[PDB]
Design a protein around this ligand. Sequence first.
Ligand SMILES: OC[C@H]1O[C@@](CO)(OC[C@@]2(OC[C@@]3(O[C@H]4O[C@H](CO)[C@@H](O)[C@H](O)[C@H]4O)O[C@H](CO)[C@@H](O)[C@@H]3O)O[C@H](CO)[C@@H](O)[C@@H]2O)[C@@H](O)[C@@H]1O
Ligand SMILES: [Ca+2]
Ligand SMILES: [Ca+2]
Length: 488
Amino acid sequence: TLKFMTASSPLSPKDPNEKLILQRLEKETGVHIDWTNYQSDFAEKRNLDISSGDLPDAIHNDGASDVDLMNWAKKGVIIPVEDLIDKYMPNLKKILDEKPEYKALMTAPDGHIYSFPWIEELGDGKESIHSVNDMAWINKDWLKKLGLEMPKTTDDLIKVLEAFKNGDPNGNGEADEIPFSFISGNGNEDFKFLFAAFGIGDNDDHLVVGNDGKVDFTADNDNYKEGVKFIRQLQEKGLIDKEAFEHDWNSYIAKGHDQKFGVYFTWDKNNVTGSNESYDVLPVLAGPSGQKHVARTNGMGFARDKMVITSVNKNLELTAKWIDAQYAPLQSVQNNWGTYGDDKQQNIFELDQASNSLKHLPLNGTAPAELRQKTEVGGPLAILDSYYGKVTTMPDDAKWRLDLIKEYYVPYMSNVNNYPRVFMTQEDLDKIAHIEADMNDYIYRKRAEWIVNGNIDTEWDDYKKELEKYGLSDYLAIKQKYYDQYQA
Ligand SMILES: OC[C@H]1O[C@@](CO)(OC[C@@]2(OC[C@@]3(O[C@H]4O[C@H](CO)[C@@H](O)[C@H](O)[C@H]4O)O[C@H](CO)[C@@H](O)[C@@H]3O)O[C@H](CO)[C@@H](O)[C@@H]2O)[C@@H](O)[C@@H]1O
Ligand SMILES: [Ca+2]
Ligand SMILES: [Ca+2]
């Protein structure tokens, strides 16, 4: 018996032990987990537990930031685990011996390892499945219906959206068409993907790496100004979803499912407009001066912390062995993606007993993300490029996305490098975190304000000064420092 805090989807059972995977796991391991399972606001609820001294044995599927992780280590909330890996975790050792770069990625600059990672190999470099998150999707049915060609430029896009607005492409005599929509902020449904059509573009870090080796701050660039102006034009012309700055995922996908969107953003259309050929990828567009670019995210198939062990943990050896069971290939694949042989609900896999390998089943039009979030576990695991065809099939939705990324975006990803996943010192993390406490929401708040009020030209210099007062220069110097050490 161990006590784990975890994070899961609101679609999944309130008690994680209702998951088929965890049932089978308790049989296999003989460990029963008592779960504290937060399904909304995990990070905030976790932090209250930590602040009140109400710690589990370990926090599963945690996803803490680096600053959190180091703060917790310094205050003795969590423990270093490297001795536990050496002594009790042969599955993990195997992985780290085959792919030693993950060990580097796990290790803090004080020399300790504080967390167990998630590793999922799907594409490399520019071809990473993570290279673009908020892909743009377009209603090709409407285009074909209105006699329109796929737009090639930002100007074409405006015209297409105007025709969507006024042209009644769904043919019901109603102005029900929402030409352009998004969910504003970080994440897969934001519009920042289009900013690159004005050069450089933007990502959730607001940080790219120039081909000069200089870290660039995106959200102060004239190019970024132009991107905001473009979205403002869309606003002024009545082409943006009237609730874009208010709605949520559930509302976004309700409209999606009714196919109200002309152009919208998401990871995979199948989750929002469904599994049809009405919507396809919006190809990379040329800006007005011929800019044609895809900004790279800094995302990768690695998250440093999907589990930590607290300093109250009862049985370090038992914990460490339980965790290592998650790194066995079959377990890792399932924990990540779902399972087989549920006699009562849909299954992501079938187990082929002849090979003892997993195989992706077709979904009867069920959303990718929907069944997954019900049946996955998250937590620490590894899926290596050598598992495909031997331990498991590659997901078809993954393969498909990798193809799209390679076909539509890679040619226009002209930045040789993105920002590497460094592990900064505690002091530097703390410094950075203070700065981001000001910048982060300020950056989104002004972006939205300018789209809605049209005053970017008169507020831009003052916004840049404000960003300097928050410490943007110190922030960049720190970023650049770690990028330079990484390259050396
Ligand atoms: O294209 C399919 C392949 O893409 C991957 C890339 O890792 O999976 C992406 C995918 O699932 C991610 C998932 O979790 C994310 O969203 C959570 C909700 O906030 C968040 O807690 C996780 O930390 C974050 O990783 O999203 C779904 C739904 O939440 C969940 O079940 C997943 O763990 O993203 C799309 C939805 O945004 C999904 O369609 C897709 O699975 C790779 O795993 C896939 O093979
Ligand atoms: Ca209509
Ligand atoms: Ca800049």
